[PDB]
UniProtKB/Swiss-Prot annotation:
Segments for region (Interaction with CCAR1): 1-242
Record note on domains: Composed of three domains: a modulating N-terminal domain, a DNA-binding domain and a C-terminal ligand-binding domain. In the presence of bound steroid the ligand-binding domain interacts with the N-terminal modulating domain, and thereby activates AR transcription factor activity. Agonist binding is required for dimerization and binding to target DNA. The transcription factor activity of the complex formed by ligand-activated AR and DNA is modulated by interactions with coactivator and corepressor proteins.
Residues reported to bind 17beta-hydroxy-5alpha-androstan-3-one: N35, R82, T201
UniProt source species: Rattus norvegicus
Site (Interaction with coactivator FXXLF and FXXFY motifs): E221
Protein name as it appears in the record: Androgen receptor
Similarity comment: Belongs to the nuclear hormone receptor family. NR3 subfamily.
Coiled coil location: none
Length: 243
């Protein structure tokens, strides 16, 4: 079981947001801390992705591209999983030091997006997703969003993506196809969520000075350079099933 050995070994550790929980729960304070969390998580997602089986067979530019497109989905998926194990069905465990109750979901002005992330977290429970299924699905998510113009070497990407589909299939097989149906629908459901957060974070960056929300350097860059390519349709998710 080489492949699963690898996925479990490279899985990133606990990451703290650096949030001072002693301050009043403001919009400005919550969102600056999520942005800080995003910056620190992006560091772990990079090292993780670079260590995945076959990842270096991608052209260097494509390596950087898929990470920059996929990070939001990847982080949301992992977060829902932490949430499942750590908190109740009504809260979102962004970090040990940044757990959203209903009040914070409201003050963040992200209530409706939070409701979707919670549903995602509950689906992991409802479907009884295993650690092994979780890890293979999360690897797949990295290879689930690409430019419509195609990548620098698209051929290598398509082959890598095929291998990770086959790995998820293997993990399932151990009816059988009903599980595969379920997992692919779950995977698809990530993308509309990421899309709403993309739109939210983009809007927030533009108004960020007016509302006193701080955006760290990598975040500022990625949200101004890469996110708008998603929002304008130059970069699109790959769905398993038609939307
Ligand atoms: C990826 C993060 C931070 C990491 C995580 O656990 C998921 C979470 C989802 C909401 C994101 C947040 C990073 C900062 C964003 C993009 C804010 O600007 C608005 C929505 C936030």
């Amino acid at each position: 079981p080489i492949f699963l050995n690898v996925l479990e070994a490279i899985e990133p550790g606990v990451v703290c947001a650096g949030h001072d929980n002693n301050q009043p729960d403001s919009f400005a304070a919550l969102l600056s801390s999520l942005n800080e969390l995003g910056e620190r998580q992006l560091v772990h997602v990079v090292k993780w992705a670079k260590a995945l089986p076959g990842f270096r067979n991608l052209h260097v530019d494509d390596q950087m591209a898929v990470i920059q497109y996929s990070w939001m989905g990847l982080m949301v998926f992992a977060m829902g999983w932490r949430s499942l194990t750590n908190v109740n069905s009504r809260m979102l465990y962004f970090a040990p030091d940044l757990v959203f109750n209903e009040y914070r979901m409201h003050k963040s002005r992200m209530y409706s997006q939070c409701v979707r992330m919670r549903h995602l977290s509950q689906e992991f429970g409802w479907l009884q997703i295993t650690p092994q299924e979780f890890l293979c699905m999360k690897a797949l998510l990295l290879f689930s969003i690409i430019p419509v113009d195609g990548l620098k070497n698209q051929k290598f990407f398509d082959e890598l993506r095929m291998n990770y589909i086959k790995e998820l299939d293997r993990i399932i097989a151990c009816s059988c196809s009903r599980r595969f149906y379920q997992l692919t629908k779950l995977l698809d459901s990530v993308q509309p969520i990421a899309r709403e957060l993309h739109q939210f974070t983009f809007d927030l960056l533009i108004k960020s000075h007016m509302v006193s929300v701080d955006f760290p350097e990598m975040m500022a860059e990625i949200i101004s350079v890469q996110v708008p390519k998603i929002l304008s349709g130059k970069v699109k998710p790959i769905y398993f099933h038609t939307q």
